[PDB]
Write a protein that binds this ligand. Structure first.
Ligand SMILES: [Cu+2]
Ligand SMILES: [Cu+2]
Ligand SMILES: [Zn+2]
Ligand SMILES: [Zn+2]
Lengths: 207, 205
Protein backbone atom coordinates (compact mmCIF):
# COMPACT_ATOMS: atom_id res chain seq x y z
CA UNK A 1 0.00 0.00 0.00
CA UNK A 2 1.44 3.37 -1.15
CA UNK A 3 2.31 5.75 1.71
CA UNK A 4 2.34 9.42 0.63
CA UNK A 5 4.54 12.12 2.26
CA UNK A 6 3.85 15.90 2.17
CA UNK A 7 6.20 18.53 3.57
CA UNK A 8 4.59 21.94 4.17
CA UNK A 9 1.93 20.97 1.54
CA UNK A 10 4.39 19.85 -1.16
CA UNK A 11 4.30 16.19 -2.34
CA UNK A 12 7.58 14.33 -1.33
CA UNK A 13 6.11 10.87 -2.20
CA UNK A 14 8.27 8.42 -4.15
CA UNK A 15 6.86 7.52 -7.59
CA UNK A 16 6.73 3.70 -7.01
CA UNK A 17 6.87 3.22 -3.18
CA UNK A 18 10.67 2.58 -3.45
CA UNK A 19 13.53 4.67 -2.03
CA UNK A 20 16.71 4.69 -4.18
CA UNK A 21 20.16 5.48 -2.73
CA UNK A 22 23.64 4.76 -4.24
CA UNK A 23 22.08 2.27 -6.73
CA UNK A 24 20.01 0.23 -4.19
CA UNK A 25 16.15 0.17 -3.92
CA UNK A 26 14.31 -0.39 -0.58
CA UNK A 27 10.59 -0.03 0.24
CA UNK A 28 10.15 3.63 1.23
CA UNK A 29 7.88 2.80 4.26
CA UNK A 30 7.49 0.15 6.93
CA UNK A 31 4.64 0.34 9.45
CA UNK A 32 5.24 -1.47 12.73
CA UNK A 33 3.20 -1.17 15.99
CA UNK A 34 1.33 1.68 14.24
CA UNK A 35 4.68 3.62 13.74
CA UNK A 36 5.73 4.65 10.15
CA UNK A 37 9.43 4.08 9.45
CA UNK A 38 11.49 5.34 6.52
CA UNK A 39 15.06 4.54 5.45
CA UNK A 40 17.71 6.57 7.35
CA UNK A 41 19.02 8.03 4.01
CA UNK A 42 15.45 9.28 3.12
CA UNK A 43 14.58 11.09 6.32
CA UNK A 44 16.64 14.31 5.47
CA UNK A 45 14.21 15.02 2.62
CA UNK A 46 11.28 14.83 5.11
CA UNK A 47 12.76 16.95 8.00
CA UNK A 48 14.61 19.74 6.09
CA UNK A 49 17.84 19.27 8.14
CA UNK A 50 20.96 17.35 6.99
CA UNK A 51 20.96 13.80 8.41
CA UNK A 52 24.36 12.16 8.96
CA UNK A 53 24.56 8.38 9.29
CA UNK A 54 27.47 6.31 10.70
CA UNK A 55 26.45 2.79 9.54
CA UNK A 56 28.86 0.59 11.61
CA UNK A 57 28.24 2.50 14.93
CA UNK A 58 24.48 2.97 14.11
CA UNK A 59 24.70 6.74 14.93
CA UNK A 60 22.39 9.43 13.45
CA UNK A 61 23.55 13.06 13.67
CA UNK A 62 21.09 15.85 12.92
CA UNK A 63 22.41 19.30 12.12
CA UNK A 64 26.14 18.78 12.96
CA UNK A 65 28.06 15.53 12.37
CA UNK A 66 29.14 13.77 15.60
CA UNK A 67 32.31 11.61 15.67
CA UNK A 68 32.56 9.03 18.43
CA UNK A 69 36.20 8.28 19.27
CA UNK A 70 37.34 4.88 20.53
CA UNK A 71 40.66 3.28 21.53
CA UNK A 72 42.08 0.11 19.93
CA UNK A 73 39.99 -1.99 22.43
CA UNK A 74 36.64 -0.42 21.23
CA UNK A 75 36.21 1.67 24.44
CA UNK A 76 34.89 5.27 24.21
CA UNK A 77 37.61 7.96 24.72
CA UNK A 78 35.60 11.01 23.65
CA UNK A 79 33.79 12.69 20.78
CA UNK A 80 33.90 15.52 18.33
CA UNK A 81 31.46 17.75 16.46
CA UNK A 82 32.12 19.14 12.99
CA UNK A 83 30.66 22.38 11.59
CA UNK A 84 31.08 23.94 8.15
CA UNK A 85 32.80 27.38 8.22
CA UNK A 86 34.25 29.62 5.48
CA UNK A 87 36.87 27.45 3.60
CA UNK A 88 37.08 24.89 6.46
CA UNK A 89 35.44 22.50 8.91
CA UNK A 90 35.62 23.41 12.61
CA UNK A 91 36.31 20.37 14.85
CA UNK A 92 35.31 20.63 18.53
CA UNK A 93 36.89 17.65 20.28
CA UNK A 94 36.69 16.26 23.82
CA UNK A 95 38.94 13.34 24.78
CA UNK A 96 39.89 11.64 28.06
CA UNK A 97 42.37 8.98 29.16
CA UNK A 98 45.23 9.94 26.76
CA UNK A 99 48.95 10.19 27.71
CA UNK A 100 50.00 13.73 28.70
CA UNK A 101 51.67 15.72 25.95
CA UNK A 102 51.13 16.48 22.27
CA UNK A 103 49.36 13.96 19.99
CA UNK A 104 49.14 14.00 16.22
CA UNK A 105 45.55 14.60 15.10
CA UNK A 106 44.37 14.25 11.47
CA UNK A 107 41.54 13.39 9.14
CA UNK A 108 42.46 10.09 7.50
CA UNK A 109 41.28 9.11 4.01
CA UNK A 110 39.20 5.97 4.79
CA UNK A 111 36.56 4.88 7.31
CA UNK A 112 37.84 2.60 10.06
CA UNK A 113 36.58 -0.94 9.40
CA UNK A 114 36.08 -3.36 12.30
CA UNK A 115 37.71 -0.88 14.76
CA UNK A 116 41.20 -1.51 13.12
CA UNK A 117 42.90 1.89 12.74
CA UNK A 118 45.26 0.59 9.99
CA UNK A 119 42.18 0.52 7.70
CA UNK A 120 41.87 4.38 7.93
CA UNK A 121 44.70 4.71 5.40
CA UNK A 122 46.85 7.79 5.11
CA UNK A 123 46.00 11.45 5.75
CA UNK A 124 43.17 12.95 3.73
CA UNK A 125 45.11 14.67 0.93
CA UNK A 126 42.79 15.67 -1.96
CA UNK A 127 45.16 18.59 -2.99
CA UNK A 128 48.22 16.26 -3.27
CA UNK A 129 50.43 18.17 -0.74
CA UNK A 130 53.18 17.02 1.64
CA UNK A 131 52.42 16.56 5.35
CA UNK A 132 52.53 19.40 7.84
CA UNK A 133 51.24 22.87 8.75
CA UNK A 134 54.92 24.01 9.18
CA UNK A 135 55.98 22.48 5.84
CA UNK A 136 56.49 24.97 2.92
CA UNK A 137 55.24 22.11 0.63
CA UNK A 138 52.36 21.33 3.05
CA UNK A 139 49.71 20.67 3.99
CA UNK A 140 47.24 17.76 3.82
CA UNK A 141 43.63 19.00 4.07
CA UNK A 142 43.48 16.35 6.89
CA UNK A 143 46.27 18.03 8.95
CA UNK A 144 45.31 19.67 12.25
CA UNK A 145 47.52 20.95 15.10
CA UNK A 146 48.55 18.51 17.79
CA UNK A 147 45.96 17.65 20.44
CA UNK A 148 47.46 18.97 23.74
CA UNK A 149 46.68 16.50 26.50
CA UNK A 150 47.16 17.65 30.10
CA UNK A 151 48.57 15.89 33.22
CA UNK A 152 44.86 14.85 33.82
CA UNK A 153 44.80 12.90 30.49
CA UNK A 154 42.14 15.23 29.01
CA UNK A 155 41.99 17.35 25.84
CA UNK A 156 39.42 19.98 24.80
CA UNK A 157 40.16 21.85 21.56
CA UNK A 158 38.79 23.56 18.50
CA UNK A 159 40.78 22.69 15.36
CA UNK A 160 40.15 23.66 11.72
CA UNK A 161 40.32 21.21 8.79
CA UNK A 162 41.49 23.93 6.36
CA UNK A 163 39.58 23.74 3.00
CA UNK A 164 37.52 20.76 4.26
CA UNK A 165 33.81 20.67 3.39
CA UNK A 166 30.71 18.88 4.79
CA UNK A 167 29.09 19.19 1.32
CA UNK A 168 28.72 15.72 -0.40
CA UNK A 169 30.58 14.61 -3.59
CA UNK A 170 33.29 17.35 -3.49
CA UNK A 171 37.04 16.66 -3.69
CA UNK A 172 37.48 18.04 -0.07
CA UNK A 173 34.39 16.33 1.43
CA UNK A 174 35.41 14.98 4.90
CA UNK A 175 32.12 13.00 5.33
CA UNK A 176 32.57 9.22 5.45
CA UNK A 177 36.26 9.38 6.54
CA UNK A 178 37.90 9.15 9.98
CA UNK A 179 39.63 11.15 12.71
CA UNK A 180 42.79 9.59 14.19
CA UNK A 181 44.68 10.55 17.36
CA UNK A 182 48.30 9.37 17.40
CA UNK A 183 50.60 8.10 20.17
CA UNK A 184 53.39 10.55 19.19
CA UNK A 185 53.76 14.27 18.58
CA UNK A 186 53.33 15.54 14.99
CA UNK A 187 56.48 17.48 14.08
CA UNK A 188 54.51 19.50 11.47
CA UNK A 189 57.10 18.78 8.65
CA UNK A 190 57.90 15.03 8.10
CA UNK A 191 56.01 12.84 5.54
CA UNK A 192 53.76 11.03 5.81
CA UNK A 193 52.44 11.86 9.31
CA UNK A 194 54.88 14.19 11.09
CA UNK A 195 56.57 11.25 12.82
CA UNK A 196 53.19 10.86 14.75
CA UNK A 197 53.60 7.06 15.05
CA UNK A 198 50.80 4.69 16.14
CA UNK A 199 47.07 5.30 16.06
CA UNK A 200 45.82 5.25 19.67
CA UNK A 201 42.24 6.50 19.14
CA UNK A 202 39.92 7.18 16.25
CA UNK A 203 36.43 7.38 14.98
CA UNK A 204 34.34 7.53 11.85
CA UNK A 205 32.91 10.71 10.31
CA UNK A 206 29.35 9.92 9.28
CA UNK A 207 27.94 10.66 5.80
CA UNK B 1 21.02 3.14 17.57
CA UNK B 2 22.16 6.66 18.79
CA UNK B 3 20.66 10.09 17.96
CA UNK B 4 22.51 13.42 18.24
CA UNK B 5 20.93 16.83 17.57
CA UNK B 6 23.34 19.73 16.87
CA UNK B 7 25.83 17.69 19.00
CA UNK B 8 23.71 16.67 22.08
CA UNK B 9 22.72 13.03 22.80
CA UNK B 10 18.93 12.50 22.24
CA UNK B 11 19.14 8.63 22.30
CA UNK B 12 16.34 6.62 23.95
CA UNK B 13 17.01 4.95 27.33
CA UNK B 14 16.11 1.39 26.12
CA UNK B 15 15.93 1.53 22.27
CA UNK B 16 12.16 2.22 22.14
CA UNK B 17 10.17 5.11 20.69
CA UNK B 18 6.98 5.94 22.74
CA UNK B 19 4.21 6.40 20.12
CA UNK B 20 0.45 5.70 19.82
CA UNK B 21 0.42 4.61 23.54
CA UNK B 22 2.73 1.69 22.68
CA UNK B 23 6.48 1.32 22.15
CA UNK B 24 8.14 0.82 18.77
CA UNK B 25 11.85 0.07 18.35
CA UNK B 26 13.73 3.41 17.77
CA UNK B 27 15.01 1.55 14.59
CA UNK B 28 14.26 -1.46 12.31
CA UNK B 29 16.73 -3.32 10.10
CA UNK B 30 14.88 -4.88 7.13
CA UNK B 31 16.91 -6.63 4.45
CA UNK B 32 20.15 -4.62 5.13
CA UNK B 33 18.41 -1.16 5.33
CA UNK B 34 18.11 0.81 8.62
CA UNK B 35 14.63 2.35 9.01
CA UNK B 36 13.84 5.01 11.62
CA UNK B 37 10.49 6.35 12.81
CA UNK B 38 9.47 9.43 10.75
CA UNK B 39 7.81 10.91 13.87
CA UNK B 40 10.91 10.53 16.11
CA UNK B 41 13.21 12.35 13.61
CA UNK B 42 10.54 15.00 12.77
CA UNK B 43 9.97 15.54 16.58
CA UNK B 44 13.75 15.99 17.07
CA UNK B 45 13.78 18.96 14.52
CA UNK B 46 10.51 20.37 15.98
CA UNK B 47 8.49 19.71 12.81
CA UNK B 48 4.89 18.58 13.42
CA UNK B 49 3.71 15.24 11.95
CA UNK B 50 0.16 14.16 11.10
CA UNK B 51 -1.28 10.93 9.69
CA UNK B 52 -4.48 10.25 7.74
CA UNK B 53 -5.47 6.57 7.32
CA UNK B 54 -7.79 6.59 4.30
CA UNK B 55 -5.29 8.44 2.05
CA UNK B 56 -2.34 6.70 3.81
CA UNK B 57 -0.61 10.08 4.01
CA UNK B 58 1.99 11.46 6.39
CA UNK B 59 1.72 15.26 6.50
CA UNK B 60 4.87 17.00 7.83
CA UNK B 61 4.87 20.64 8.97
CA UNK B 62 1.18 21.22 8.15
CA UNK B 63 -1.78 18.91 7.57
CA UNK B 64 -2.82 18.04 3.97
CA UNK B 65 -6.41 16.84 3.38
CA UNK B 66 -7.06 14.64 0.31
CA UNK B 67 -10.60 15.06 -1.08
CA UNK B 68 -12.51 12.27 -2.86
CA UNK B 69 -15.96 11.98 -4.52
CA UNK B 70 -18.54 9.22 -3.71
CA UNK B 71 -16.80 7.01 -6.39
CA UNK B 72 -13.41 7.27 -4.53
CA UNK B 73 -11.69 9.43 -7.24
CA UNK B 74 -9.21 12.05 -5.93
CA UNK B 75 -10.97 15.44 -6.71
CA UNK B 76 -8.49 17.73 -4.91
CA UNK B 77 -6.56 18.76 -1.86
CA UNK B 78 -6.39 21.31 1.02
CA UNK B 79 -3.55 22.48 3.25
CA UNK B 80 -4.34 23.64 6.80
CA UNK B 81 -2.23 26.18 8.67
CA UNK B 82 -2.53 27.52 12.23
CA UNK B 83 -3.16 31.29 12.27
CA UNK B 84 -4.07 33.79 14.98
CA UNK B 85 -7.80 33.75 13.98
CA UNK B 86 -8.24 29.97 13.53
CA UNK B 87 -7.08 27.61 10.75
CA UNK B 88 -6.34 28.78 7.23
CA UNK B 89 -7.59 26.35 4.51
CA UNK B 90 -6.11 26.52 1.00
CA UNK B 91 -8.25 24.21 -1.15
CA UNK B 92 -8.26 23.03 -4.80
CA UNK B 93 -11.02 20.73 -6.12
CA UNK B 94 -12.11 19.48 -9.59
CA UNK B 95 -15.17 17.62 -10.90
CA UNK B 96 -17.72 20.06 -9.34
CA UNK B 97 -20.86 21.56 -10.98
CA UNK B 98 -20.47 25.28 -11.79
CA UNK B 99 -21.85 27.55 -9.08
CA UNK B 100 -21.60 27.87 -5.30
CA UNK B 101 -21.02 24.82 -3.09
CA UNK B 102 -21.38 24.57 0.71
CA UNK B 103 -18.04 23.80 2.37
CA UNK B 104 -17.74 22.89 6.07
CA UNK B 105 -15.71 21.09 8.68
CA UNK B 106 -17.92 18.20 9.91
CA UNK B 107 -17.62 16.62 13.37
CA UNK B 108 -16.47 13.07 12.44
CA UNK B 109 -14.00 11.34 10.10
CA UNK B 110 -15.65 9.89 6.94
CA UNK B 111 -15.97 6.07 7.42
CA UNK B 112 -15.19 4.48 3.95
CA UNK B 113 -16.58 7.13 1.53
CA UNK B 114 -19.97 7.24 3.37
CA UNK B 115 -20.23 11.05 3.72
CA UNK B 116 -23.25 10.73 6.16
CA UNK B 117 -20.79 9.20 8.67
CA UNK B 118 -19.10 12.63 8.97
CA UNK B 119 -22.10 13.77 11.09
CA UNK B 120 -23.15 17.43 11.37
CA UNK B 121 -21.03 20.59 11.21
CA UNK B 122 -18.24 20.90 13.78
CA UNK B 123 -19.94 22.98 16.48
CA UNK B 124 -17.86 23.03 19.68
CA UNK B 125 -19.27 26.50 20.73
CA UNK B 126 -22.98 25.37 20.30
CA UNK B 127 -24.00 28.12 17.78
CA UNK B 128 -26.57 27.99 14.91
CA UNK B 129 -25.37 27.49 11.30
CA UNK B 130 -24.36 30.31 9.03
CA UNK B 131 -21.89 33.16 8.54
CA UNK B 132 -24.87 35.52 7.84
CA UNK B 133 -26.89 34.31 10.89
CA UNK B 134 -26.89 36.70 13.90
CA UNK B 135 -27.05 33.49 16.08
CA UNK B 136 -24.21 31.81 14.05
CA UNK B 137 -21.79 30.41 13.39
CA UNK B 138 -20.44 26.83 13.61
CA UNK B 139 -16.63 26.79 13.99
CA UNK B 140 -16.83 24.45 10.95
CA UNK B 141 -18.62 27.00 8.72
CA UNK B 142 -16.67 28.34 5.71
CA UNK B 143 -17.95 30.39 2.78
CA UNK B 144 -19.22 28.73 -0.36
CA UNK B 145 -16.70 27.44 -2.84
CA UNK B 146 -17.26 29.30 -6.16
CA UNK B 147 -16.79 26.76 -8.97
CA UNK B 148 -16.13 28.02 -12.52
CA UNK B 149 -17.41 26.61 -15.86
CA UNK B 150 -14.29 24.29 -15.77
CA UNK B 151 -15.63 22.50 -12.61
CA UNK B 152 -12.59 23.77 -10.54
CA UNK B 153 -12.61 25.38 -7.03
CA UNK B 154 -9.53 27.30 -5.75
CA UNK B 155 -10.03 29.16 -2.46
CA UNK B 156 -8.47 30.44 0.74
CA UNK B 157 -10.79 30.34 3.76
CA UNK B 158 -10.59 30.49 7.56
CA UNK B 159 -12.05 28.02 10.04
CA UNK B 160 -12.76 30.79 12.57
CA UNK B 161 -11.48 29.87 16.09
CA UNK B 162 -10.41 26.41 14.85
CA UNK B 163 -7.08 25.04 16.04
CA UNK B 164 -4.51 22.43 15.01
CA UNK B 165 -3.37 22.20 18.69
CA UNK B 166 -4.30 18.74 20.17
CA UNK B 167 -6.92 18.14 22.91
CA UNK B 168 -8.70 21.55 22.66
CA UNK B 169 -12.47 22.10 22.33
CA UNK B 170 -11.90 23.61 18.84
CA UNK B 171 -9.28 21.05 17.56
CA UNK B 172 -10.13 20.20 13.89
CA UNK B 173 -7.55 17.37 13.70
CA UNK B 174 -9.24 13.99 13.04
CA UNK B 175 -12.46 15.54 11.62
CA UNK B 176 -13.47 16.01 7.99
CA UNK B 177 -14.10 18.52 5.22
CA UNK B 178 -17.32 18.16 3.15
CA UNK B 179 -18.23 19.85 -0.15
CA UNK B 180 -21.98 19.94 -0.86
CA UNK B 181 -24.01 19.75 -4.11
CA UNK B 182 -25.89 22.98 -3.28
CA UNK B 183 -25.21 26.57 -2.22
CA UNK B 184 -24.98 27.31 1.53
CA UNK B 185 -27.52 30.11 2.19
CA UNK B 186 -25.49 31.28 5.24
CA UNK B 187 -28.57 31.35 7.58
CA UNK B 188 -30.54 28.01 7.73
CA UNK B 189 -29.94 25.57 10.67
CA UNK B 190 -28.34 23.10 10.44
CA UNK B 191 -26.35 23.19 7.08
CA UNK B 192 -27.60 26.30 5.19
CA UNK B 193 -29.77 24.11 2.88
CA UNK B 194 -26.51 23.04 1.06
CA UNK B 195 -28.05 19.62 0.23
CA UNK B 196 -26.17 16.39 -0.63
CA UNK B 197 -22.50 15.72 0.18
CA UNK B 198 -20.57 15.25 -3.10
CA UNK B 199 -16.89 15.31 -1.93
CA UNK B 200 -14.97 15.05 1.29
CA UNK B 201 -11.71 14.28 3.00
CA UNK B 202 -10.45 13.44 6.47
CA UNK B 203 -8.35 15.89 8.42
CA UNK B 204 -5.13 14.27 9.61
CA UNK B 205 -4.25 13.87 13.30
CU1 LIG C 1 46.90 10.76 11.48
CU1 LIG D 1 -21.15 20.46 5.31
ZN1 LIG E 1 49.24 14.88 7.13
ZN1 LIG F 1 -22.69 24.97 9.84
Amino acid sequence: SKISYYVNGKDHSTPAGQFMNQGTAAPDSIIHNGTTYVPVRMVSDLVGQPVYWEQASRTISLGLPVVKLYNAAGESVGSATLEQINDGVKVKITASGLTPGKHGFHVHENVIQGGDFKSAGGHFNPTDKHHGLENPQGSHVGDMPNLVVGTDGNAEAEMIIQHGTLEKDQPNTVLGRSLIIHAGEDDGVTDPSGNSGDRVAGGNIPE
